[PDB]
């Protein structure tokens, strides 16, 4: 699978787990459309999202409910999501995994293409 | 000020500068609304984006044009934009700083609140 996201919990020193994540596809007219969406698993992965043929260029936003996931811990923060937006390019590498390192007033994202 | 944003550019150990910011409030139709912009300065820095009377309670997106940046510098980078989502002043008014640290595939962002 083409698209991977890995989410981390910097406050517990842990994965990220049951956490919901949203990935939308930009419309022609400008506006966010449902493309995919999971909860992470207990390795704070969600795999399985889209395949090589749906995953075509284009730019996709992937939305990850921080706020969700830090108020079922009992904890206070700061954002109501955190979001990640990029084009996807076919010219060259294929599988893309977004990470993010969650703490209550700051995220951390990055983003690996290989292969 | 009640909102200050800061940014940096960690390939070159330097304040990010010329970096265009564009905040949105969202409405009572759940639509974002634009809400201040404005660029960063020779020090990373963007101040005066808005007021105390006008800085009300609600959610806000301060949208961070990282990919207008990195291409003004001749460099191809993986996101479109780096997103900070959050309710403000629902307990009365705060201060905040945004800051965001840039890499090409990565970026960092936190928040300080102070009262
Ligand atoms: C194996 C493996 C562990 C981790 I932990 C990881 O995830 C991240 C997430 C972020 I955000 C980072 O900055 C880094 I380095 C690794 C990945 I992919 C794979
Ligand atoms: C003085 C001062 C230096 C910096 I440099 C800074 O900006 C950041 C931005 C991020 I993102 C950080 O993680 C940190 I620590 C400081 C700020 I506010 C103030």
Same mark, same amino acid.
């Given at each position: 699978?083409?698209?991977?996201?890995?989410?981390?919990?910097?406050?517990?020193?842990?994965?990220?787990?049951?956490?919901?994540?949203?990935?939308?596809?930009?419309?022609?007219?400008?506006?966010?459309?449902?493309?995919?969406?999971?909860?992470?698993?207990?390795?704070?992965?969600?795999?399985?999202?889209?395949?090589?043929?749906?995953?075509?260029?284009?730019?996709?936003?992937?939305?990850?409910?921080?706020?969700? +996931?830090?108020? &079922?811990?009992?904890? =206070? !923060?700061?954002?109501?999501?955190?979001?990640? %937006?990029? $084009?996807?390019?076919?010219?060259?590498?294929?599988? +893309?995994?977004? &990470?993010?390192?969650? =703490? !209550?007033?700051?995220?951390?994202?990055?983003? %690996?293409? $290989?292969?």
């Amino acid at each position: 699978c083409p698209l991977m996201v890995k989410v981390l919990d910097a406050v517990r020193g842990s994965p990220a787990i049951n956490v919901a994540v949203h990935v939308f596809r930009k419309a022609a007219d400008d506006t966010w459309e449902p493309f995919a969406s999971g909860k992470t698993s207990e390795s704070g992965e969600l795999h399985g999202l889209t395949t090589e043929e749906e995953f075509v260029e284009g730019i996709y936003k992937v939305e990850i409910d921080t706020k969700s +996931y830090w108020k &079922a811990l009992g904890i =206070s !923060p700061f954002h109501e999501h955190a979001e990640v %937006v990029f $084009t996807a390019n076919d010219s060259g590498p294929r599988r +893309y995994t977004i &990470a993010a390192l969650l =703490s !209550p007033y700051s995220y951390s994202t990055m983003a %690996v293409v $290989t292969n």
